[PDB]
Amino acid sequence: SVILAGILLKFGTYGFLRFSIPMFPEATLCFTPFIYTLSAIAIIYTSLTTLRQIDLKKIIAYSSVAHMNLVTIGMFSLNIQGIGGSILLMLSHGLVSSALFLCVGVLYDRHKTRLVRYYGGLVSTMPNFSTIFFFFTLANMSLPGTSSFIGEFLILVGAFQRNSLVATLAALGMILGAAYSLWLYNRVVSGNLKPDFLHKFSDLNGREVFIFIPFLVGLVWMGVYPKVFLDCMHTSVSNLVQHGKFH
Amino acid sequence: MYLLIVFLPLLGSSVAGFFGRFLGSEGSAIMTTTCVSFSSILSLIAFYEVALGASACYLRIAPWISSEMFDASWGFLFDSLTVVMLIVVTFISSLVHLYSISYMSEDPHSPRFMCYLSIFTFFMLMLVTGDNFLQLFLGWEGVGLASYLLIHFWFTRLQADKAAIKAM
Amino acid sequence: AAYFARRAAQKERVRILYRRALKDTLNWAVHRHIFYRDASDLREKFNVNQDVEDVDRIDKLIAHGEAEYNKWRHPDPYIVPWAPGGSKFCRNPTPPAGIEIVYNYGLED
Amino acid sequence: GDFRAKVWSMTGGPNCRPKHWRRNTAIAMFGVFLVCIPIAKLSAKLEQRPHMPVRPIPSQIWCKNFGTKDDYEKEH
């Protein structure tokens, strides 16, 4: 799941960035309303479907559909904010969704269930896991300070300058993603234990803590100082944006 | 001294949150109250300097989000409105920390509570001191988060969880 | 028997209806001295019908009394803070028994 | 409670009463002061005060950026 969400999903957006936008700029222009409509529908409908999912992995997996379609809106905005934000959100999603799948995997390896109803009250038996899970939950809501907020807001900036309606439909994700992320976190970690389902617990071992450390460092690092990444990308992004025009 | 105003509650919250197991209730109550009270004292000095002295302060740490014309930065603005809000926030927060020392004295989890109070104070300071819309937005979301964390502080209560989710 | 149980179940309904009506009389009155009169008047409603023997009529009166309670019920009833629905309910509960914490999980060996 | 005594947390869990909490509190206070020294130095270096204050102020002791932005035409 980590490889599928963090890398393989990025191949379609990489193909859009690498071949479709620069090779056929006129078609890219002609199809832009089509892409905007598809992505906006995906963000709203898939976020609302996410809200009604009862499986941990199913909630994290549906979340990725909304995030990648925001990425597509950004890249088809065809400006610096749009493409820069699309790339930054691709990388940030690759970190954040991978960490979330790792959290769910930590839970599944011990308890062998993905159904949310069995869990609850885990803050009192697994506080370290609870804290790390909360951090990555915040990152998945695009909380300012986290890496995903940079890409999300830069994409909204890029979209607003082209079409204010598409930016408005895409900013609804701020409300829906919060809703499902916080609902998931509070149903898993908050509340009381249910000893008739689970009564034996273990917090993270050293290997799991170490695994989480670089994800935390990368998320915070991109969130507070995205300049290291954006400085290495601007020339390429600029030439992609300009390709096909000579004024 | 102007950076100390903003970052002292963050330091206190960090020590109460990451090392509360070494301080316990009493240590964490002291550590957090001291750091916010010192920020309050420095805030009074800043009110004397900026509003009464008519000498605004501008401090730019580093760029935050630089993409072509988009120029969000880690920058702080201290004018009369800013120091007025600074006095209000830091003084009320110091008093509330002191009050909580005795109000939550029988609560099992007071160090986490004090850490949350201090992190809220830091995010509110980031809100009122920002020199641009994006730092203000960071403070906006941070105080939203701290409010959510404090509303459902008693995490076993279903009413509190519903209220916190509704507020967010 | 059966007539005894059927009459007994009715009695329970009346005793519980009266208890809830009395507790609500206190929600609408607040002050003790107003409660005294209001409670006296509610008790007089039940006493007027206390002596009915017909069982279908008892059932109709019980249903009417429940409907009346449910309509004139105080929107925001008082609850003891630690009771279910109270302001202190499920704050700092005692931990459940039967919880085991495992050490040395997930070792490479 | 009973099982929570076997549960490790950074904040210490319920009713945390470390035996050496006074010495630990003192060590934390010394650490926060040491961390605050470089922050204060950087703040003094970074502060910009375009206007001379009406009366002398404490920041004039350590900050040397008073009345430096007058030629804003040359800003870059």
């Binding site: 370290n128 273990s202 917090d203 993270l204 071992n205 050293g206 803590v209 | 197991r21 316990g24 209730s25 009493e26 004295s105 | 914490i101 495992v102 050490y103 040395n104 999980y105 | 929570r4 005594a5 076997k6 549960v7 490790w8 947390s9 210490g12 869990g13 945390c16 009463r17 470390p18 035996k19 050496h20 909490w21 006074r22």
Partner: peptide
Amino acid sequence: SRWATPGHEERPKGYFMNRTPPAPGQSR
């Protein structure tokens, strides 16, 4: 009395990362 009488936790509750300590004098 909470400020003048030292705490009772000679050692903290739990074990960091849920690993039992090594035997006295030994290393993990």
